[PDB]
Structures are given as structure tokens and as C-alpha cells.
Coordinates of C-alpha atoms and ligand atoms in Angstrom, one line a residue:
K41 CA -12.6 21.2 -4.0
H42 CA -13.7 19.1 -1.4
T43 CA -12.3 16.2 -1.9
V44 CA -13.8 12.5 -2.4
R45 CA -11.2 10.1 -1.9
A46 CA -12.0 6.7 -3.3
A47 CA -9.7 3.7 -4.4
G48 CA -10.1 0.8 -7.1
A49 CA -8.6 -1.7 -8.6
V50 CA -7.2 -3.9 -11.5
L51 CA -8.2 -7.3 -10.4
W52 CA -6.4 -10.3 -12.0
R53 CA -6.2 -13.6 -12.8
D54 CA -3.8 -16.4 -14.8
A55 CA -5.8 -17.3 -17.8
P65 CA 3.5 -10.7 -18.4
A66 CA 0.0 -10.1 -20.2
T67 CA -1.5 -13.9 -20.0
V68 CA -3.6 -12.5 -17.5
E69 CA -7.7 -11.9 -17.1
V70 CA -8.8 -8.7 -15.5
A71 CA -12.2 -8.3 -14.1
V72 CA -14.5 -5.3 -15.8
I73 CA -17.6 -4.5 -14.6
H74 CA -21.2 -3.3 -15.6
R75 CA -23.2 -1.4 -12.9
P76 CA -27.3 0.1 -14.1
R77 CA -27.3 2.7 -12.5
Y78 CA -24.4 4.5 -15.2
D79 CA -24.9 1.8 -17.7
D80 CA -21.2 2.0 -17.6
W81 CA -17.8 -0.9 -17.8
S82 CA -15.1 0.1 -15.5
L83 CA -12.8 -1.2 -12.7
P84 CA -14.5 -2.0 -9.4
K85 CA -13.6 0.9 -6.8
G86 CA -15.7 2.9 -4.2
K87 CA -15.3 5.1 -1.9
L88 CA -13.3 5.1 1.8
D89 CA -15.1 4.8 5.0
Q90 CA -14.8 6.3 8.1
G91 CA -11.6 5.4 9.4
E92 CA -10.0 3.7 6.3
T93 CA -7.6 4.1 4.5
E94 CA -7.2 3.8 0.2
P95 CA -5.9 -0.2 0.2
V96 CA -8.5 -1.1 2.9
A97 CA -11.4 0.2 0.6
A98 CA -9.8 -1.2 -2.5
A99 CA -9.8 -4.2 -0.7
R100 CA -13.3 -4.2 0.3
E101 CA -14.9 -2.8 -2.7
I102 CA -13.3 -5.3 -5.1
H103 CA -15.0 -8.1 -2.0
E104 CA -18.7 -6.3 -2.3
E105 CA -18.3 -5.3 -6.2
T106 CA -17.0 -8.7 -7.9
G107 CA -17.5 -11.4 -4.9
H108 CA -13.5 -11.9 -5.2
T109 CA -10.9 -11.8 -2.2
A110 CA -7.7 -10.3 -3.2
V111 CA -4.3 -9.5 -2.4
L112 CA -3.2 -5.9 -3.1
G113 CA 0.2 -5.3 -5.3
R114 CA 1.4 -2.2 -7.1
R115 CA -0.2 0.5 -6.6
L116 CA -1.5 2.4 -10.3
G117 CA -2.1 5.8 -10.2
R118 CA -4.8 8.1 -9.2
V119 CA -7.9 9.3 -11.2
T120 CA -9.9 12.7 -10.7
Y121 CA -12.8 14.0 -11.9
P122 CA -15.2 16.5 -11.0
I123 CA -18.8 15.6 -9.3
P124 CA -21.2 17.5 -7.6
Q125 CA -19.5 17.3 -4.1
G126 CA -16.0 18.9 -5.8
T127 CA -13.5 16.3 -6.7
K128 CA -13.4 12.6 -7.0
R129 CA -10.0 11.4 -6.2
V130 CA -9.6 7.6 -6.7
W131 CA -6.1 5.9 -6.7
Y132 CA -6.1 2.5 -7.9
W133 CA -4.0 -1.1 -7.0
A134 CA -2.8 -4.7 -9.0
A135 CA -4.7 -7.1 -7.1
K136 CA -4.6 -10.7 -7.5
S137 CA -8.1 -12.8 -7.1
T138 CA -7.7 -15.2 -4.3
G139 CA -10.8 -16.6 -5.1
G140 CA -15.1 -16.1 -5.0
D141 CA -17.5 -16.1 -7.4
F142 CA -19.8 -12.8 -8.2
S143 CA -23.4 -12.9 -8.1
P144 CA -25.4 -10.1 -10.2
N145 CA -27.6 -7.8 -8.8
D146 CA -28.8 -4.4 -9.1
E147 CA -25.9 -2.3 -8.1
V148 CA -23.1 -4.5 -10.1
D149 CA -25.0 -7.0 -12.8
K150 CA -22.5 -8.2 -15.1
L151 CA -18.6 -8.7 -14.7
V152 CA -16.4 -10.0 -17.5
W153 CA -12.9 -11.6 -17.2
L154 CA -10.8 -10.5 -20.3
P155 CA -7.4 -10.2 -21.7
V156 CA -5.7 -6.9 -21.4
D157 CA -6.0 -5.8 -24.6
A158 CA -9.8 -6.8 -24.9
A159 CA -10.5 -5.3 -21.4
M160 CA -8.7 -1.8 -22.8
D161 CA -11.7 -2.0 -25.4
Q162 CA -14.6 -2.8 -23.1
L163 CA -13.7 0.2 -20.4
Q164 CA -15.5 3.1 -21.7
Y165 CA -13.3 5.7 -19.1
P166 CA -10.0 7.5 -20.7
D167 CA -8.7 7.3 -17.2
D168 CA -9.5 3.4 -16.6
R169 CA -7.8 2.9 -19.6
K170 CA -4.4 4.8 -18.3
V171 CA -4.8 2.8 -15.1
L172 CA -4.5 -0.4 -17.1
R173 CA -2.0 0.6 -19.3
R174 CA 0.2 0.8 -16.1
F175 CA -0.7 -2.4 -15.3
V176 CA 0.8 -3.8 -17.9
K177 CA 3.9 -1.7 -17.8
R178 CA 5.4 -3.8 -15.3
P179 CA 5.3 -7.4 -13.4
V180 CA 2.0 -8.1 -11.8
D181 CA 2.7 -11.5 -10.0
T182 CA 4.8 -9.6 -7.0
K183 CA 6.2 -9.9 -3.7
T184 CA 6.0 -7.3 -1.4
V185 CA 8.2 -5.7 1.5
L186 CA 6.2 -3.2 3.3
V187 CA 8.6 -0.4 5.5
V188 CA 6.4 1.4 7.9
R189 CA 7.6 4.1 10.1
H190 CA 6.5 3.8 13.8
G191 CA 3.5 5.7 15.0
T192 CA 3.4 8.8 17.0
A193 CA 5.4 8.7 20.1
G194 CA 5.6 11.7 21.9
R195 CA 8.8 13.8 22.0
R196 CA 12.7 13.1 21.9
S197 CA 13.8 15.2 24.6
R198 CA 16.2 17.6 23.5
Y199 CA 19.5 16.2 24.4
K200 CA 21.4 14.7 21.7
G201 CA 20.5 11.1 20.9
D202 CA 17.6 8.7 20.8
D203 CA 15.3 7.0 23.1
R204 CA 15.2 3.3 23.2
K205 CA 12.2 2.3 25.6
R206 CA 9.8 5.8 25.1
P207 CA 6.5 4.3 24.2
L208 CA 3.6 5.4 21.2
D209 CA 1.3 7.8 22.7
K210 CA -2.8 7.6 22.2
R211 CA -2.0 8.6 18.7
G212 CA 0.3 6.5 18.1
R213 CA -1.6 3.2 19.6
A214 CA -4.6 4.2 17.1
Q215 CA -2.4 4.2 14.0
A216 CA -1.1 1.0 15.0
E217 CA -4.8 -0.7 15.3
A218 CA -5.3 1.2 11.9
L219 CA -2.2 -0.4 10.4
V220 CA -3.4 -3.7 10.8
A221 CA -6.0 -3.8 7.7
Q222 CA -3.8 -1.4 5.9
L223 CA -0.9 -4.4 6.0
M224 CA -3.0 -7.6 5.6
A225 CA -4.7 -5.6 2.0
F226 CA -1.1 -6.3 0.7
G227 CA -0.5 -10.0 2.7
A228 CA 2.0 -8.8 5.0
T229 CA 3.1 -12.5 6.0
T230 CA 6.3 -12.4 8.8
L231 CA 7.0 -9.1 10.9
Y232 CA 10.6 -7.4 11.6
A233 CA 11.3 -4.0 14.0
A234 CA 14.4 -2.0 14.7
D235 CA 15.4 -2.4 18.6
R236 CA 13.2 0.4 19.8
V237 CA 9.9 0.4 22.0
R238 CA 8.2 2.2 19.7
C239 CA 8.7 0.4 16.5
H240 CA 7.4 -2.9 18.1
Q241 CA 4.1 -1.2 19.5
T242 CA 3.6 -0.1 16.1
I243 CA 3.8 -4.0 14.7
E244 CA 2.5 -5.7 17.8
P245 CA -1.8 -5.0 16.9
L246 CA -0.8 -6.7 13.5
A247 CA 1.7 -9.7 15.3
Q248 CA -1.9 -10.5 17.4
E249 CA -3.7 -10.4 14.3
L250 CA -1.5 -13.2 12.3
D251 CA -0.7 -14.5 15.9
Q252 CA 3.1 -14.1 14.7
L253 CA 6.3 -12.9 16.7
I254 CA 8.2 -9.6 15.9
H255 CA 11.7 -10.2 14.9
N256 CA 13.9 -7.7 16.4
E257 CA 16.2 -6.0 14.2
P258 CA 19.3 -3.7 16.1
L259 CA 21.0 -3.3 12.7
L260 CA 17.9 -1.0 11.9
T261 CA 17.5 1.7 14.2
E262 CA 19.1 5.2 14.1
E263 CA 22.2 4.6 15.5
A264 CA 23.2 2.2 13.5
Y265 CA 22.6 3.1 9.8
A266 CA 24.0 6.0 11.2
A267 CA 27.3 3.5 12.0
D268 CA 27.0 1.3 9.4
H269 CA 24.4 2.1 6.5
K270 CA 26.1 -1.1 4.4
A271 CA 25.5 -3.5 6.9
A272 CA 21.5 -1.7 7.0
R273 CA 21.4 -2.0 3.1
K274 CA 22.4 -5.6 3.1
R275 CA 20.4 -6.5 6.4
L276 CA 16.7 -5.0 4.1
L277 CA 17.8 -7.0 1.3
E278 CA 18.0 -10.5 3.5
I279 CA 15.0 -10.0 4.7
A280 CA 13.3 -9.1 1.6
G281 CA 15.1 -12.5 -0.1
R282 CA 13.0 -14.7 2.3
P283 CA 9.7 -16.2 1.5
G284 CA 6.7 -13.9 2.5
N285 CA 5.6 -10.5 2.6
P286 CA 7.4 -9.1 5.4
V287 CA 7.1 -6.1 7.6
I288 CA 9.6 -3.7 8.8
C289 CA 9.3 -1.5 11.1
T290 CA 11.9 1.5 12.0
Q291 CA 12.6 4.9 12.2
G292 CA 12.3 8.3 10.3
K293 CA 15.9 8.6 9.7
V294 CA 16.5 5.2 8.1
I295 CA 13.8 5.0 6.2
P296 CA 14.2 7.4 3.2
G297 CA 17.8 6.6 2.9
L298 CA 16.9 2.8 2.3
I299 CA 14.2 3.5 0.2
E300 CA 16.4 6.1 -2.1
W301 CA 19.3 4.0 -2.4
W302 CA 17.3 0.9 -3.3
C303 CA 15.0 3.3 -6.0
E304 CA 18.1 4.3 -7.5
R305 CA 19.9 0.9 -8.3
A306 CA 16.6 -0.4 -9.6
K307 CA 15.5 2.7 -11.8
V308 CA 12.3 2.9 -10.1
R309 CA 10.0 6.5 -9.8
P310 CA 8.3 6.8 -6.8
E311 CA 5.0 8.4 -7.5
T312 CA 4.4 9.4 -4.2
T313 CA 7.4 10.5 -1.2
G314 CA 7.1 11.8 2.6
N315 CA 8.7 10.0 5.8
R316 CA 5.6 10.5 8.1
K317 CA 5.3 8.9 11.4
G318 CA 2.4 6.0 10.6
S319 CA 3.6 5.6 6.9
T320 CA 4.5 2.4 4.8
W321 CA 6.4 2.3 1.6
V322 CA 4.9 -0.8 -0.6
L323 CA 7.9 -2.3 -2.2
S324 CA 6.9 -4.8 -4.8
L325 CA 9.2 -7.0 -6.2
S326 CA 9.5 -9.6 -9.2
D327 CA 12.3 -12.0 -9.3
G328 CA 14.0 -10.1 -6.7
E329 CA 14.2 -6.9 -8.4
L330 CA 12.2 -3.7 -7.1
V331 CA 9.3 -3.2 -9.6
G332 CA 7.6 -0.6 -7.6
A333 CA 7.7 1.7 -4.4
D334 CA 4.5 3.3 -3.2
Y335 CA 4.3 5.5 -0.4
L336 CA 1.0 5.2 1.6
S337 CA 0.4 8.1 4.0
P338 CA 0.0 7.7 7.7
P339 CA -3.5 5.6 8.3
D340 CA -5.1 9.0 10.2
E341 CA -3.8 11.7 7.4
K342 CA -5.3 12.3 4.0
Ligands
LIG401 N1 -13.0 7.3 -14.4 C1 -14.0 8.4 -14.5 N2 -13.7 9.5 -15.2 C2 -14.8 10.4 -15.5 N3 -16.2 10.0 -14.8 C3 -16.7 9.1 -14.6 C4 -15.5 8.1 -14.2 N4 -16.0 7.6 -13.5 C5 -17.0 7.6 -12.9 N5 -17.5 9.0 -13.7 C6 -18.8 9.5 -13.9 O1 -19.0 10.2 -12.7 C7 -20.2 10.1 -12.7 C8 -20.2 9.5 -11.0 O2 -19.9 8.3 -10.9 P1 -18.9 7.3 -9.6 O3 -18.2 6.0 -10.6 O4 -17.8 7.9 -9.0 O5 -20.6 7.3 -8.6 P2 -20.9 6.4 -7.2 O6 -21.9 6.0 -7.2 O7 -20.1 7.3 -6.2 O8 -19.6 5.3 -7.5 P3 -18.5 4.7 -6.4 O9 -19.2 3.9 -5.3 O10 -18.0 3.7 -7.3 O11 -17.3 6.0 -5.9 C9 -21.0 9.1 -13.3 O12 -21.9 9.9 -14.1 C10 -20.0 8.3 -14.1 O13 -20.2 8.0 -15.3
LIG402 N1 17.0 14.9 20.9 C1 17.3 14.5 19.6 N2 18.5 14.0 19.2 C2 18.9 13.8 17.8 N3 17.6 13.9 17.1 C3 16.5 14.6 17.4 C4 16.4 14.5 18.7 N4 15.0 15.5 19.0 C5 14.6 14.8 17.9 N5 15.7 15.0 16.6 C6 14.9 14.2 15.4 O1 13.7 14.8 15.3 C7 13.3 13.4 14.6 C8 11.6 13.4 15.1 O2 12.0 13.1 16.6 P1 10.6 12.7 17.5 O3 10.7 13.1 19.4 O4 9.2 13.8 16.7 O5 9.8 11.4 16.9 P2 11.0 9.9 17.4 O6 9.7 9.0 17.9 O7 11.8 10.0 18.0 O8 11.0 9.3 15.3 P3 12.2 8.3 14.8 O9 12.5 7.3 15.6 O10 11.4 8.2 13.4 O11 13.1 9.6 15.0 C9 14.2 12.6 14.3 O12 14.1 11.7 13.5 C10 15.6 13.1 15.0 O13 15.9 13.5 13.0
LIG403 MG1 -18.5 1.7 -7.0

């Protein structure tokens, strides 16, 4: 009944399924499995997955597509593990008492090495779609108090204390996907959400008047074409906008690409990870706000 939250990865490298994936052995359990671990206080699942990859395998990585959820019973209640595809960006494994072996295997061989049926289902998802993906990160701005009850939008209303903390927490989450470039709708609260990331990257935030609530309602087509324009540029863009805009854009793109999101939501501080392969949408993964389950 109590849930223990964890995250892990299919860590891959170049040798389509030409790639090799990492499978680890743990002496405590005598098991062969995918790297994973429990979320620390304040972490979200992507942050934990990236950290655990580095701690268990020695590799840095960039997360891509989400690969589903595993649950199993434990004395504490239920363990829940979300998985990501993760491209290695280098490193070296050193055997130790917690993880004593790491093998790099083609997917078919890794399938045989993995002992847990639900790890094998994660690996089957991994191979269903391309893995060398670029990433568009669509973020609903953080909490920013409430609009006045007179009909309309407020341009300058800032994040509240909670929302500032969400913005700070988003840095590690968005970095986990290799965010490179920053865009925000023409509202203060949208810029403030990604300001911490902007400081981390030392990047400017490109202002997007076409992506506000009012602009989307006046001209949804221009908003859609702007999203595609941004997505088409080199790098992995973060686009921070508003609640009336995101569901429509995501639904539209998923529908025309025939992509099924495994989770849905639209909470302030949430992120949609849109995975692209040669311009085609291949994944749409809704991440909860950093301070919500
Ligand atoms: N995918 C799985 N399906 C079913 N049982 C599993 C799975 N992974 C591990 N187990 C079992 O559950 C028990 C706890 O293993 P688990 O990997 O959750 O422990 P842990 O030490 O808390 O690891 P972690 O730090 O990776 O979260 C072990 O006996 C293990 O064999
Ligand atoms: N005065 C208002 N006029 C029009 N819509 C409103 C008004 N107040 C609330 N809403 C609706 O409620 C939603 C949430 O409003 P709230 O004031 O909680 O947050 P918000 O910071 O404005 O959110 P967002 O920028 O994502 O729209 C809005 O997206 C809008 O749909
Ligand atoms: Mg572990």
C-alpha cells in the first residue's frame, strides 16, 4: 500500500537494435538487472534515474523516451520503478561490493541475461521505437497564486513561493534530458519557471508571444506552426507555457503522429517529454510537477 518510488534505465551505446545495452550484476541478490534506484528526498524520477545510472555503471547519460513502469511487492508495500532510455555519454565501470559486474550486450542477448520478466518487458519497449531521439520539453509554468476573478489573463503575475521552488527543482529534471535552448510564452510566470535553468545554462530565454493563452485562442494554427519551428531547430528545447495551450498542442501532435501517451495531466510545473526521430514524434511522456507524486 505504501509506495516506494524508484527509477531506472536502459543505458545504451552504439556498437535500430545495433546498439548495446548495460546489464548489471548485484552480489546481494545474485541478480542480473537494469540499473535503478530509489528517489532521494527532492528528486524526481528522471533525476534519480540519471544519478543511479552514474552511481551503478559509472556512466553519464542523457535520458530520452520513457519505457513504462514496473511494480512489485516489497515488505514496505509496493515498489514502483519508472524506466527511461538513456544514451551513454561516457564513463567507466568499476566493480564493487554493490555492483560487481557490468556487461554490454545486444538487445537479444540482454533479453536472455535479464532475469526479471518485467525488465524484459522494459527492453521490449525500448526496441519498439527509435532510441537516438531529440527531445522537446513542454513545461507548464509553476504555481503563481490565482488570477483575479475578472475574465482575462494577467501578464506580470509572478510565481509564488511554491512555484519558485518548483522552478529550482526543474533544473535537474530538465538537464537530465539534455535541455539546451530555452523558450517561454510572453508571461512573467512562464519566464520565471525556467529562469533557474537559464542561469544554470547561462542561456537567454526566447520570448514567445504566439504561445500565450490569448494567442492560442486567437490563432491556434500559428501556435502549432511555432511549436514545430522551435522543434525543428538544432538542440533540445524547453518551451514553458500555460494550461490552456499545452493540452491542445500535445493532443494535436500525438493524434497526427499516432503516439499514445502512457500518462496524462496538465499540472502547474509539469513537463511533457516529446521524443523525436527524424522529425517524427515517437514518444510523449507526461511528468508530474517536481513536488507532486
Ligand atoms: N523487476 C523485479 N521484479 C520482481 N522482483 C524484483 C525485481 N527487481 C528486484 N526484485 C526483488 O525484490 C527484492 C528487492 O530488490 P530491489 O532491487 O528492489 O532492492 P533494493 O536493494 O532496494 O534495490 P534498489 O536500490 O535498486 O532500489 C529482491 O529480492 C529482488 O530480487
Ligand atoms: N479570471 C479568469 N479568466 C479566465 N480564465 C480563468 C480566470 N481565472 C481562472 N481561470 C482559468 O483557471 C486556470 C488556472 O488559473 P490560475 O489563476 O489558477 O492559474 P494561472 O497561473 O493563470 O494558470 P495558467 O497560466 O496555466 O492559465 C486558467 O488556466 C484558466 O483556465
Ligand atoms: Mg539499485
